[PDB]
């Protein structure tokens, strides 16, 4: 049977344009769609339907077989609510998390025949030589927020057995994914997962405890030049927005006179206590920062260069919930966009793992550069939100400072 | 007409059918329409109705050597975008034969969702508004009604599925009232198949056209003439005159701007100059000598035949890009040397501050984006930049940037880095401590410096802004300093520079500083908080 889904009051269906796709990509999608059509999952549609959601194809880390991925971000945002499961604050504590793709379990359930129109999507033709192939869903779509919802009971229903077989293991569900964490060592872990699948199948490596949100560390030297100090002052001065106890008075005094940027200045004991006092303030995360569930989660990223990137997740400015550094993966050496999207997938998963919802990203890339090639390296079932920005020269100089082993 | 499953049409949200009054006409326009409608009435297109229809659309009567649905439409629901992007020659494949069937009034061949038919009611007037008028309605898609192009295509698409299944090696393009049909068969088997399709159509009521109306190669598509083996650019013709109005000069620059794509060398600097301070579209501006000339220098180029070749999937796709000048780029996409599919250029995108490599990055992406639409593939690039300059730049820039598989080609002018701020304070170099200040209200400012070598200066500025003084200070620094300089400033903008090192700006001043930076052997920019 089907349940009556609807749109948030006074909202209309998505009418988002299908961006152009590669041939390789189109061939697969056509291939993939004739099948689901056959299997009755989707049905071609008419011109009297004007809604549309973008689609594309991806190789979910392990393929040759392409996976169909839809961007229901608009639909999701326009779809009524159902007021998922409350976040197991304990998941982020597990020694190791493993993710499972279970969108496959949705086609089973039929979609309200009155909400289907809104799930319309289009397969483009190269050189517009053919009118796009217009389809729509007859079953539950993967990537839509209504799916994991409607399929909740059925889902919860099948996991109890496993849940009751291991209770030292947490099962978290987000969209199409399933986040499974436990403390069993590796072998006893992945054997407990394949074991989990088997069960999961007769129907249809993360380590959170290492995520040491690290500190800021100021440079230490034998002798400091006028320039050395100026740079430090700048950084500290900025950092004073976070730790008001930080002071550069005594240092900004050593900076009296028009001396050579390269000349060396001796640190007064005062400027020394002062510095030493700042080193202390930066020693621990600022007090009072608490996550608000009725507020959006933000993820701002910076390109430090040389394969390096840093990020901060907050809700209120300078009140970071977590900080990190991302280093490119073997292979992405000459691809800024690949490095970036891999970065974003990681952060969004960490975010999900800790707060169970995606953050809205602030990206150091031009909309054009991003939109053109992101899908090329995306591997997640979900798609977070983003906006493109210009990195303030200081924010980068400051975070480039964070500590390393 | 048709045994074709109708499409369910509805009115926009809660609105209701048109009720506009029937425009009054002569005894001559009425008897004309009285003629044509009794015709349609019989063909099975329209249907005489009566007092059971509040709706009404204004029928007019023009003689070609007509019904105004404006309102009915503005009340009709929204359909899916009737194909809005069309093929481009550069992406077409060569065919042996290509026939174009003219499914003209195939509109009046498709049934209109019965229920909706009412809304399309109209009335024939009486001789000077006498007794009741003649009332009718549409049983088929109405020429001019919003939902007809989409509903027609949908239909044509459904109808062709069988044939298309029946012969894959036969490409059929749906467009407007034309079915451009091509193949790689022998002219005989082709001719035979056209008649087969033609008859399939006939099996659904679409009376496809005669020999008289018949269309054949070459075909005019966008700005090209299409031949099945290759295409040619429809020669463009610049008019000659003894009197040029404004419109005259614009419509021209337009045409010329279009040519710039294909044709290389086209210029309109002196031609554009004639629009300066223009009072009215009809004004007559005598062409300067310079304008008379360049106009003459173009006429020539345009008199050059530019033919082209079609897309060959079995061959590679290449793109070469040339920086025609600062901020302008030329590109040509070919598979086999000198046999281009497409070419084109990008107007001097005048940003606020960027550099050549970044600008190259955008041309590259605008292209890639173009390519992916035309070919579902992305070209190999031949770029006038050393792979070192690339690595050197991109690897450090503050923003995610990238360039698909590419290869250098030493086709000057090559794009390079005009300068590079030192990574570390220069030992030895003089150190200018700069400062600019101004009263933002009185716009009166001062800018100057003092160095560790005891050199100082201050200039009083007027009609300036603070950013300008801050920057001027730096300009003076570069002016009064040697080949290697250190510069410390508390300027927020100077901070944007150390991070982006732009080599072109919207600000002439910034430009001057850039010209200075490009001149030094070493420059170190240091920013510091103020006060
Ligand atoms: C779009 C268009 C103008 C089609 C008819 O003109 C030609 C099209 C092709 N090549 C192709 S792939 C083709 C054949 C039928 O429809 C298409 C899109 C080649 C020569 C000409 Cl003259």
Swiss-Prot record, chain A:
Consequence of substituting residue 180 to I: Confers resistance to HBY 097
Effect upon mutating residue 129 to K: Confers resistance to emivirine
Result when mutating residue 70 to L: Confers resistance to HBY 097
Mutagenesis / variant outcome for changing residue 65 to R: Confers resistance to zidovudine
Effect seen on changing residue 170 to D: Confers resistance to efavirenz, tivirapine and trovirdine
Phenotypic consequence of residue 181 to Q: Confers resistance to efavirenz, HBY 097 and nevirapine
Effect upon mutating residue 69 to V: Confers resistance to abacavir, didanosine, HBY 097 and zalcitabine
Effect of substituting residue 305 to E: Confers resistance to abacavir, lamivudine and zidovudine
Effect on the protein upon substituting residue 181 to V: Confers resistance to efavirenz and nevirapine
Effect after changing residue 92 to E: Confers resistance to atevirdine, efavirenz, nevirapine and zidovudine
Outcome of mutating residue 62 to N: Confers resistance to zidovudine
Result when mutating residue 69 to I: Confers resistance to HBY 097
Reverse transcriptase domain span: 39-206
Residue positions binding Mg(2+) 1: 101, 176-177
Consequence when changing residue 305 to D: Confers resistance to abacavir, lamivudine and zidovudine
Impact noted for substituting residue 126 to M: Confers resistance to delavirdine, efavirenz and nevirapine
Result of altering residue 64 to N: Confers resistance to lamivudine and stavudine
Protein known as: p51 RT
Species assigned in the record: Human immunodeficiency virus type 1 group M subtype B (isolate HXB2) (HIV-1)
UniProtKB/Swiss-Prot annotation, chain B:
Effect of residue 176 to T: Confers resistance to abacavir, didanosine, emtricitabine, lamivudine and zalcitabine
Sequence ranges assigned to domain Reverse transcriptase in this UniProt record: 43-226
Effect noted on mutating residue 211 to E: Confers resistance to zidovudine
Substitution effect: residue 200 to Y: Confers resistance to lamivudine, pyrophosphate analog PFA and zidovudine
Phenotype when changing residue 378 to I: Confers resistance to abacavir, lamivudine and zidovudine
Region (RT 'primer grip'): 219-227
UniProt function note: Multifunctional enzyme that converts the viral RNA genome into dsDNA in the cytoplasm, shortly after virus entry into the cell. This enzyme displays a DNA polymerase activity that can copy either DNA or RNA templates, and a ribonuclease H (RNase H) activity that cleaves the RNA strand of RNA-DNA heteroduplexes in a partially processive 3' to 5' endonucleasic mode. Conversion of viral genomic RNA into dsDNA requires many steps. A tRNA(3)-Lys binds to the primer-binding site (PBS) situated at the 5'-end of the viral RNA.
Protein name: Reverse transcriptase/ribonuclease H
Source organism: Human immunodeficiency virus type 1 group M subtype B (isolate HXB2)
Lineage: Viruses, Riboviria, Pararnavirae, Artverviricota, Revtraviricetes
Residues of the full protein shown: 589 to 1126 of 1435
């Amino acid at each position: 049977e089907t349940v009556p889904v609807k749109l948030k009051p006074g909202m209309d269906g998505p009418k988002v344009k299908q961006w152009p796709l590669t041939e390789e990509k189109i061939k697969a999608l056509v291939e993939i769609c004739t099948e689901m059509e056959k299997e009755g999952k989707i049905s071609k549609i008419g011109p009297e339907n004007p809604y549309n959601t973008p689609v594309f194809a991806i190789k979910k880390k392990d393929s040759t077989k392409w996976r169909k991925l839809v961007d229901f971000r608009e639909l999701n945002k326009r779809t009524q609510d159902f007021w998922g499961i409350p976040h197991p604050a304990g998941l982020k504590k597990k020694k190791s998390v493993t993710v499972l793709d279970v969108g496959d379990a949705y086609f089973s359930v039929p979609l309200d025949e009155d909400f289907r129109k809104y799930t319309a999507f289009t397969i483009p033709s190269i050189n517009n030589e053919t009118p796009g192939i217009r389809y729509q869903y007859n079953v539950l779509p993967q990537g839509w927020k209504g799916s994991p919802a409607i399929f909740q009971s059925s889902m919860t229903k099948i996991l109890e057995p496993f849940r009751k077989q291991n209770p030292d293991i947490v099962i978290y569900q987000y969209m199409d994914d399933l986040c499974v964490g436990s403390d069993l060592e590796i072998g006893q872990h992945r054997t407990k997962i394949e074991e989990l699948r088997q069960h999961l199948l007769r129907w249809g490596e993360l380590h959170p405890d290492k995520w040491t949100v690290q500190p800021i560390v100021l440079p230490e030297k034998d002798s400091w030049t006028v320039n050395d100090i100026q740079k430090l002052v700048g950084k500290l001065n900025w950092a004073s927005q976070i730790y008001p106890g930080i002071k550069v008075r005594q240092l900004c005094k050593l900076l009296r006179g028009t001396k050579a940027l390269t000349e060396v200045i001796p640190l007064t004991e005062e400027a020394e206590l002062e510095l030493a006092e700042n080193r202390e303030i930066l020693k621990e995360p600022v007090h009072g920062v608490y996550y608000d569930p009725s507020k959006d989660l933000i993820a701002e990223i910076q390109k430090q260069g040389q394969g390096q990137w840093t990020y901060q997740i907050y809700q209120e400015p300078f009140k970071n919930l977590k900080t990190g550094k991302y280093a490119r993966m073997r292979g992405a050496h000459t691809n800024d966009v690949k490095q970036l999207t891999e970065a974003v997938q990681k952060i969004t998963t960490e975010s999900i793992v800790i707060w169970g919802k995606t953050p809205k990203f602030k990206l150091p890339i031009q909309k054009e550069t991003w939109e053109t090639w992101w899908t090329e390296y995306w591997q997640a079932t979900w798609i977070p939100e983003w906006e493109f920005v210009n990195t303030p020269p200081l924010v980068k100089l400051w975070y480039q400072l964070e500590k390393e082993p | 007409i048709s045994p074709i499953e109708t499409v369910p049409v509805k009115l926009k949200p809660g609105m209701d059918g048109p009720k506009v009054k029937q425009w009054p006409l002569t005894e001559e326009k009425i008897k004309a329409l009285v003629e044509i409608c009794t015709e349609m009435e019989k063909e099975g297109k329209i249907s005489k109705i009566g007092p059971e229809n509040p709706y009404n659309t204004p029928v007019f009567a023009i003689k070609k050597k007509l019904v105004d649905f404006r309102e009915l439409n503005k009340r009709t629901q929204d359909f899916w975008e009737v194909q809005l992007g069309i093929p481009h020659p550069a992406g077409l494949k060569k065919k042996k034969s290509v026939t174009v069937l003219d499914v003209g009034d195939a509109y009046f061949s498709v049934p209109l969702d019965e229920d909706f038919r009412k809304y399309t009611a109209f009335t024939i007037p009486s001789i000077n508004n006498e007794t009741p008028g003649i009332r009718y309605q549409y049983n088929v898609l109405p020429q001019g009604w919003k939902g007809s192009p989409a509903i027609f295509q949908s239909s044509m698409t459904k109808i062709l599925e069988p044939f298309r299944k029946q012969n894959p090696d036969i490409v059929i393009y749906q467009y407007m009232d034309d079915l451009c049909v091509g193949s790689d068969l022998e002219i005989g088997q082709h001719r035979t198949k056209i008649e087969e399709l033609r008859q399939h159509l006939l099996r659904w009521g679409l009376t496809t056209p005669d020999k008289k109306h018949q269309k054949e190669p070459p075909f005019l598509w966008m700005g090209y003439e299409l031949h099945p083996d290759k295409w040619t650019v429809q020669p463009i013709v610049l008019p000659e005159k003894d009197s040029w109005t404004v419109n005259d000069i614009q419509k021209l620059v337009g045409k010329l701007n279009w040519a710039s794509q294909i044709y290389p060398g086209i210029k309109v600097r002196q031609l554009c100059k004639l629009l300066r301070g223009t009072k009215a579209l009809t004004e007559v501006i005598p062409l300067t000598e310079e304008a008379e000339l360049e106009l003459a220098e173009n006429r020539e180029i345009l008199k050059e035949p530019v033919h082209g070749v079609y897309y060959d999937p079995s061959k590679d796709l290449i793109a070469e890009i040339q920086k025609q000048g600062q901020g302008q780029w030329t590109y040509q996409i070919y598979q086999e040397p000198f046999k281009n599919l497409k070419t084109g250029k990008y107007a001097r995108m005048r940003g606020a501050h960027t550099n050549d490599v970044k600008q190259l990055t955008e041309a590259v992406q605008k292209i890639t984006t173009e390519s992916i639409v035309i070919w579902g593939k992305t070209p190999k690039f031949k770029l006038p930049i050393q792979k070192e300059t690339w690595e050197t730049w991109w690897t450090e820039y503050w923003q995610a940037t990238w360039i698909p598989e590419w290869e250098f080609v030493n086709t000057p002018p090559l794009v390079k880095l005009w300068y590079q701020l030192e990574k570390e304070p220069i030992v030895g170099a003089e150190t200018f401590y700069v400062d600019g200040a101004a009263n933002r209200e009185t716009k009166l400012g001062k800018a100057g410096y003092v160095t560790n070598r005891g050199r100082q200066k201050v200039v009083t500025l007027t009609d300036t802004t603070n950013q300008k003084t801050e920057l001027q200070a730096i300009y003076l620094a570069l002016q009064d300093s040697g080949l290697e300089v250190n510069i410390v400033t508390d300027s927020q903008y100077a901070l944007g520079i150390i991070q982006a090192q732009p080599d072109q700006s919207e600000s002439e001043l910034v430009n001057q500083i850039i010209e200075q930076l490009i001149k030094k052997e070493k420059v170190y920019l240091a920013w510091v908080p103020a006060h």
